[PDB]
């Protein structure tokens, strides 16, 4: 690799509309990566006053097909060349090569992403040039230290430039915890907001329900997504199974994204259920007794607070000044990381098995935010 | 497919061993001299300061097995297999193949590790020792050269080499540069003593540094597309849009040094012309004729070629780095804080058109000596 594929060139043009149009910059709206932090993007995203802006969705990294754009139908989709001014609009701009978007005289962007944050701050730049305006304001939606996506590289330093742009830019995080992250490595921003963790509405309708607890271990697996560190909790599985001789007695289930079954040893199976219906993930949390769900990051992430609050002891990971142990009473914060540990206290845990305390009350009881932003755009 | 184990913390099997003295082990992935760069040869030149007089050593080798060649380098240590259990006085054990394999470990084994893998395994050793032999857990010595967790994005890998850090055994660590032992000291990090060496410049480049020097116009560029940390890609880009937005840009050449790549067009028919690993003798005679150098380090430590191009007389853009600011070290380190093309490219036309040394704090950089001198002090505490 010779070049840097996430920084490619974003060319705009420019563009006669001259109301003020909110810009969302989002890798993509497809199905298949509605997950992560682009569904709360376009959840915040539809928070705007549409009577006050127009808006106008900009795919960054994939195309949709037909099926995908049925979640957007007010949306008029839009090729890159042309430049009309309706009030919903979506354009996809995943192959640049040689092309441009209309950007406007009062275009406000919205980045995700680092690479989005990235490329919105050198539109802003051409954007001041062209129509000889001081900066406009970007913002700047943070779900996660990004940087941490990668070993110290090119691409750390250039997603962690996106937080030492000194022009105008609003932050949103998500979570207090990674707010405060940031504002311990010393980043500014022009302002600085956030938006806590809220209970899943659906799984919020059976919280109530009776629980009929089983000797279930439930795992957050997801080998594709590193800081969910799988491989990590498989080599504390076989500790336990190997060290723990009522294991037996127990089954362990993986749930969050599909993968084989795993051996643990004793004939004992890690077995996968992919990623459930929040219905049925919903009934599996009120069988489940204990809980492994981690998180390298400053974000606690929400597997951990939901089988939490559905009675599961709770195993998870520290992290700077992430420690989720004075959250809930049924979380257990590691401190040491290791399989060894891990496995320690599952067994702990299971022997416990032969809720109470919660300081995290906002969790089930968002973007209040959102209009004293409008205000400032 | 997919990982469902973690490659680096594979078990390392020991077994007694009725050896009495007390003797130092190295924990080294290699000693071949294709991999004699990096960490693993100040470790071998540390490990070479402890008096054989009163410490047998073993060095083990748990990554890489050497061939007949490399081991010319050792021709006083005995090449020994894992099976046997010799009392030598120097000894090389090959425990990288170790399933199902086991190590001699005796009553007094002291453990050196250096990969944080290694760390990982002699703070497990211990505890079998300790339970074994039943005494009390031994000091490790952890020669720590970097921020190894950042050789890593956020992951298994990233905690397990961080965990190596938070053992709460007996534990001294020996941090190459003063600049990395702050780091570990910020993030709060705890070890039963702390000691560090400063850098020391290249013994073979000391003696041209009082050389005459004949400028030319010449960005010389230490580039390394496999190691990471060295931001070759980064680099890269920034010499496209500085041969871009540079119009005097064809009077000078771009060349690379430190890893062999293939010419990289930049642009206007200029490349980027990969020199390789130069001896040290060639890397010399390049820095002296060189003007302006380029050279990152995503990380604490501040990395070699910085200071010896610093110390030739070139103006030399490298980066800031949390505690790390080398722009206070000497006065030829330009360090940039925001770190991305457009600034590099910037400043680089800034030091050209400066074209048409000086100061210096970090005079430890090439005097004195000894900069091992905490060895006997740790000799005494084993
Ligand atoms: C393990 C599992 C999780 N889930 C859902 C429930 C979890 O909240 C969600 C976690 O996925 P993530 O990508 O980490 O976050 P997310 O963005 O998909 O989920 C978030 O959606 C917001 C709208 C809610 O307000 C939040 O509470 C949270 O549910 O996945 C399933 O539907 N099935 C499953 O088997
Ligand atoms: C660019 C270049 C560097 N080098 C050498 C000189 C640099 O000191 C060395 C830097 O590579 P690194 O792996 O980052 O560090 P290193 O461990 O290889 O080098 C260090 O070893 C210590 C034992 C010495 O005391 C130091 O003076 C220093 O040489 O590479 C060449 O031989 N040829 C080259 O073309």
Not at 324 to 341: D, F
């Given at each position: ?202 799984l919020?309708?059976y919280i109530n329900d009776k629980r009929q607890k089983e000797?279930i271990?439930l ?63 919903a009934?599996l949390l009120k069988r489940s007794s204990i809980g ?13 607070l939901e089988m939490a609050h559905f009675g599961l002891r709770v ?13 809930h009473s049924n979380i ?17 845990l299971?022997?416990s098995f032969?809720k109470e305390s919660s ?19």
């Amino acid at each position: 690799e010779t070049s840097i594929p996430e920084i490619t060139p974003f060319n705009a043009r420019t563009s006669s509309i001259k109301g003020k149009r909110l810009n969302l910059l989002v890798p993509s709206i497809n199905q298949e990566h509605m997950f992560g932090g682009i569904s709360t993007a376009l959840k915040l995203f539809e928070q705007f006053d549409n009577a006050a802006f127009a808006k106008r969705i900009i795919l960054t990294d994939a195309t949709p097909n037909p099926k995908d754009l049925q979640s957007f139908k007010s949306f008029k989709y839009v090729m890159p060349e042309e430049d009309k001014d309706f009030a919903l609009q979506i354009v996809p701009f995943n192959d640049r090569y040689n092309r441009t978007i209309p950007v406007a005289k009062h275009d406000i962007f919205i980045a995700t992403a680092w690479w989005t944050a990235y490329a919105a701050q050198r539109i802003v730049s051409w954007q001041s040039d062209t129509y000889g305006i001081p900066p406009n304001k970007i913002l700047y939606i943070i779900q996660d230290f990004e940087p941490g996506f990668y070993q110290w590289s090119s691409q750390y330093v250039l997603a962690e430039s996106t937080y030492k742009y000194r022009g105008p830019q609003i932050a949103v995080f998500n979570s207090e915890l990674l707010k405060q992250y940031f504002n311990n490595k010393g980043y500014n921003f022009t302002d600085e907001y956030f938006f806590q963790p809220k209970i899943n509405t659906t799984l919020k309708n059976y919280i109530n329900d009776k629980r009929q607890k089983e000797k279930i271990i439930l795992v957050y697996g997801r080998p594709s997504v590193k800081r969910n560190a799988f491989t990590l909790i498989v080599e504390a599985l076989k500790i336990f199974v190997q060290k723990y001789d009522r294991s037996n007695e127990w089954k362990i289930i993986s749930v969050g994204e599909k993968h084989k079954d795993i051996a643990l040893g004793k004939g004992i199976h890690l077995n996968s259920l992919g990623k459930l219906t929040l219905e049925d993930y919903a009934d599996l949390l009120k069988r489940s007794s204990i809980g492994i769900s981690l998180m390298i990051s400053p974000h606690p992430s929400y597997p951990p607070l939901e089988m939490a609050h559905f009675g599961l002891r709770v195993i998870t990971n520290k992290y700077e000044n992430k420690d989720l142990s004075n959250w809930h009473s049924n979380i257990v914060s590691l401190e040491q990381l290791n399989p060894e540990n891990i496995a320690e206290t599952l067994v702990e845990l299971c022997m416990s098995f032969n809720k109470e305390s919660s300081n995290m009350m906002f969790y089930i009881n968002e973007f209040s935010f959102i209009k004293e932003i409008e205000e400032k755009l």
